[PDB]
Amino acid sequence: KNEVMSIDNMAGVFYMLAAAMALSLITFIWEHLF
């Protein structure tokens, strides 16, 4: 009977939140000391 389930719990956002925090780190380090 098409063995799927009857919501969704992919990882997804977790990788996307980690990418967003990574971008925050990649940006806010570059302070203009020169």
Binding site: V4, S6, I7, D8, N9, L17, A20, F28
Partner: protein, 267 residues
């Protein structure tokens, strides 16, 4: 159909991510407006009122939040199409070939009327032997008994008189004829063997078949009646409940909270 079916677990994850939005945007300020500005930029984009404009990097991350929001809304519209079209819709008995008759159960009870022709077409054939020790122990005595047993939600299904069932499907909205026919025979006249009334009666019968009197009775007694076929929802009703309650509850917070801010302005 429902409420929000989308995992109150995940809804708490979404709300705490809204807190992630707010906390991060107000922490990324002083790197170079600090109370509720970026709050309403955030709730403007994520809810979907404006996408509009309003150093580089916090705006970058806000656009990342827009990417989040569009992914999340796409996921919602995906599952909302999905569980209104797809699986777990029903389970409908298709015929004698189903395992619900072939491998019988106690939560599926089937019956007929004793001393009937269905008793005959069963007790003649073979490979439904396992049927009888169900099918003989729950029987009835008239048609209306079976009808009300469907009405009283006592019995699930019937194998019975096809014309009568097509009527009471077309009469009342409770009934559906499913599957093909079984033991395909005819309805006719009963006469003794020494009764000389065979032949002229048969002549009249074929006259009735060829002169449309069969179709005359099919019009005058058989083909009149129809019920609807599903052509203001519980989702709609639940949304008006939730939104009406929440916004009237918001109304009766606006006065007191802003009036205390009017006291702050008086300070």
């Amino acid at each position: 159909s429902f409420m929000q079916p989308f995992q109150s677990t995940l809804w708490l994850l979404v709300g705490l991510s809204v807190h992630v939005v707010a906390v991060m945007l107000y922490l990324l300020d002083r790197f170079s407006l600090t109370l509720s500005s970026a709050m309403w930029f955030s709730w403007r984009v994520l809810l979907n009122s404006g996408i509009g404009e309003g150093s580089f990097s916090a705006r970058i991350l806000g656009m990342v939040w827009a990417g989040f929001a569009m992914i999340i809304v796409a996921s919602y519209t995906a599952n909302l199409a999905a569980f209104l079209v797809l699986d777990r819709p029903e389970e409908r008995i298709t015929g004698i070939n189903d395992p619900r008759l072939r491998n019988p159960s106690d939560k599926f009870i089937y019956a007929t009327v004793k001393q009937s022709s269905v008793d005959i077409y069963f007790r003649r054939q073979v490979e439904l032997s396992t049927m009888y020790r169900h099918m003989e122990k729950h029987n009835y005595e008239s048609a209306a008994e079976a009808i009300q047993a469907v009405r009283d939600n006592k019995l699930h299904a019937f194998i019975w008189d096809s014309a009568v069932l097509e009527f009471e499907a077309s009469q009342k909205c409770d009934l559906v004829t499913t599957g093909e026919l079984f033991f395909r025979s005819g309805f006719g006249i009963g006469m003794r063997k020494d009764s000389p009334w065979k032949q002229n009666v048969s002549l009249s019968i074929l006259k009735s078949h060829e002169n449309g009197f069969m179709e005359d009775l099919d019009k005058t007694w058989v083909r009149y009646q129809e019920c609807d076929s599903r052509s203001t929802f519980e989702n709609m009703a639940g949304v008006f409940m939730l939104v009406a309650g929440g916004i009237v509850a918001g109304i009766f917070l606006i006065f007191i909270e802003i009036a205390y801010k009017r006291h702050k302005d008086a300070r």
